[PDB]
Amino acid sequence: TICIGYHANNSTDTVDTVLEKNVTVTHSVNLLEDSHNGKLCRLKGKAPLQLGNCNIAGWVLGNPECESLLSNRSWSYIAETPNSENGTCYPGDFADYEELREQLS
Amino acid sequence: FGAIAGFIEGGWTGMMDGWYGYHHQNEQGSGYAADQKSTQNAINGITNKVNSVIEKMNTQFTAVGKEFNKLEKRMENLNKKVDDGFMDIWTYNAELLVLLENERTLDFHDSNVKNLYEKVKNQLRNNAKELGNGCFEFYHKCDNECMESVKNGTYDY
Amino acid sequence: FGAIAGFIEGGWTGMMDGWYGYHHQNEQGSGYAADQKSTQNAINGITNKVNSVIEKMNTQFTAVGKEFNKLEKRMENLNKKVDDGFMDIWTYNAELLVLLENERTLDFHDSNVKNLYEKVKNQLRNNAKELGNGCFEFYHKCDNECMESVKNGTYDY
Amino acid sequence: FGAIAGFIEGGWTGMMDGWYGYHHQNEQGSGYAADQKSTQNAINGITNKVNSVIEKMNTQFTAVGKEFNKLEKRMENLNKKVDDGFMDIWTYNAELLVLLENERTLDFHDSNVKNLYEKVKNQLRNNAKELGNGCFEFYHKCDNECMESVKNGTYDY
Amino acid sequence: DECDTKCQTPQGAINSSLPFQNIHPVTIGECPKYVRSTKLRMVTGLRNIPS
Ligand SMILES: *[C@@H]1O[C@H](CO)[C@@H](O[C@@H]2O[C@H](CO)[C@@H](O[C@@H]3O[C@H](CO)[C@@H](O)[C@H](O[C@H]4O[C@H](CO)[C@@H](O)[C@H](O)[C@@H]4O)[C@@H]3O)[C@H](O)[C@H]2NC(C)=O)[C@H](O)[C@H]1NC(C)=O
Ligand SMILES: *[C@@H]1O[C@H](CO)[C@@H](O[C@@H]2O[C@H](CO)[C@@H](O[C@@H]3O[C@H](CO)[C@@H](O)[C@H](O)[C@@H]3O)[C@H](O)[C@H]2NC(C)=O)[C@H](O)[C@H]1NC(C)=O
């Protein structure tokens, strides 16, 4: 005889269709970035400004718990930490705070 | 069509070389052959299709975050509304695009084998019993010199 | 294909049981039969398709309204722009999705009957005149014991 | 299907009147004929399809611009985010819609000629050698009075 | 870390070749659009039937 057929594999890959769910398939590719690398990386060739135990308020005012800037710097974004509480040690209101943060990013 | 998983039931595991082809029992090699055109035109088309779902989305530099003070709740909510809006649109349009174009891809293989099967039945005519399984009993069981020429689709009478 | 409203012209009103099947004139029951597989696989697929256009849209809690004072017209307009934007996107994408997937649904029935017709013609072979209407004149007008077995697609010579 | 650029290879330049039809060599006119129904139903359907990609987008009056002072950078960026968002959505959805519905349009012609070819082969039966090119050698080379009646699909035995 | 990316997210960076990501909605850079999805797998081949 002579037949005409197609390929089959030992692949476990399952996909969904509009007419039937969980169809097992020979070859597939992912469209969904599900994983991240867990590290702060450089953006546009620049490293972020890392404020540490300080926030922008504390850093730009010279809160004594903030590390002072040594050289001229560039940065592509600003990184704060969940425990960056050191801002205005003498209490009061910081005018247009959010605006300044956005403009310094 | 009804070629894939219709009258050609299941599939073959023995084709390490391609996606479509033939299985011949005559007087020699019982192996399988790939159709380097029926297949290398599909991969030329599928990789073209994935690469355009991937790369047709150009996206600019964007910092999504916005920070608002306690007397700016309205802005905060307007901003959240915009983020929820896009999320809802891209989530719905992506999930369905994947769903629909997957069926469009599985049909592509139906239309391909059905045309490859019709590339030999509309060529061999009444020189074989047209078994419904997707297979043809040969009247002069071609040797390996002839069978390798039906791949190119070339016969005589 | 050209099965539906092509060479099978109009349709039958006498099938209270299903969507696809047969009509036999032989020596007994002149009724219609449903193909409980050709049909119960379509409903398994269509209800699957509606339920995913419905349920693939998850949507969060959202209060769309925003209120602005007479010196906040810009915000008011930015907000209105966002609402008009979504309206335009969902209105256009929905109207077209309905339009396109309706044609994809009507084709589904063409590809189904054309395969059911080809499920018996590619099985009965030259034991009937293949009338273009979508109907076959039987050489040994099968009784009700045989005709009910062509439904399963089972013959002899 | 495999009709267009499959077994009917290339196409004909000689049809100033329509999109689909026939070429007959018998004993008289060597010209081409248009199928004023196979064609005037396609144009009724395509112009319907373009006119709905065009006109299903209703859009309101909108002034996209917004102006912000130097202490309103956040709003400025929120606004820019909204504009980039729509741009990204309409650019991606349009590019792909054009891409996909173009293939849906080229298939439409495959399914049309394949049904027109099957409108005469499923009608003439064994009164011609069914050449794989998409052409039929006539047993009683019909004159211009008969050939113009196969267009309507009308024969005898 | 001494890495470069096109897209940084609050828990880390992400490869931005894929058009959709579900890590976090509030990103910075040239990023995949955020979706609430969990699986978006697209077919390149056929269905396995080796019974
Ligand atoms: C930089 O940031 C650190 C924190 O990351 C910050 O240290 C914190 O200082 C505050 C205020 O000096 C401390 O809070 C006090 O803790 C003592 C106990 O040790 C309490 O008695 C204090 O009572 C006050 O608040 C009570 C209500 O909570 C009132 O009832 C009472 O009357 C007082 O007002 C107060 O809670 C806090 O413990 C530390 N945290 C740490 C981790 O050390 C530091 O001051 C910042 N420095 C600068 C320059 O910004
Ligand atoms: C601190 O300031 C000095 C200058 O005041 C910075 O030096 C600059 O370093 C960059 C690094 O690449 C140089 O950029 C390059 O410039 C050429 C043109 O000269 C451009 O074609 C390249 O594409 C690239 O951008 C820049 O020229 C240089 N400037 C000077 C005046 O030398 C230094 O980078 C600053 N420090 C930090 C940490 O940012």
Residue numbers in the entry:
A (entry chain A): 19 to 123
B (entry chain B), C (entry chain B), D (entry chain B): 346 to 502
E (entry chain A): 289 to 339
Anything the authors wrote about it?
HA is a homotrimeric glycoprotein, with each monomer composed of two regions: (1) the head, comprising the receptor binding domain (RBD) which is crucial in viral attachment, and (2) the stalk, that is responsible for viral and cell membrane fusion in the endosome. Mammalian IVA infection is initiated through HAs binding to α2,6 sialic acid-linkage galactose receptors on the host cell surface, before entering the cell via endocytosis. Following endocytosis, HAs undergo conformational rearrangements due to the low pH of the endosome, leading to membrane fusion.
In addition, we determined the crystal structure of A/Denver/57 HA in complex with the anti-influenza antibody C05 fragment antigen binding (Fab). Our structure showed a similar mode of antibody binding to that determined previously for C05 bound to HA from IV A/Hong Kong/1/196820. PISA analysis of the HA:C05 complex revealed that seven HA residues mediate the interaction between the HA RBD antigenic motif and the C05 heavy chain, while only two HA residues mediate binding to the C05 light chain. Interestingly, our structure of the H1N1 influenza strain A/Denver/57 HA bound to the bnAb C05 Fab indicates that both the heavy and light chains contribute to binding. Further, the surface area buried by the C05 heavy chain CDR is ~ 786 Å2, which is close to that of the 2D1 antibody. Comparing the structure of A/Denver/57 HA in complex with C05 Fab to our six other HA structures showed differences in the C05 antibody binding site. The antibody C05 Fab failed to bind many of our other IVA HAs, as examined by analytical size exclusion chromatography. Failure to bind correlated with an insertion in HA between 146R-G147 of the epitope, whereas sequences without an insertion bound the antibody.
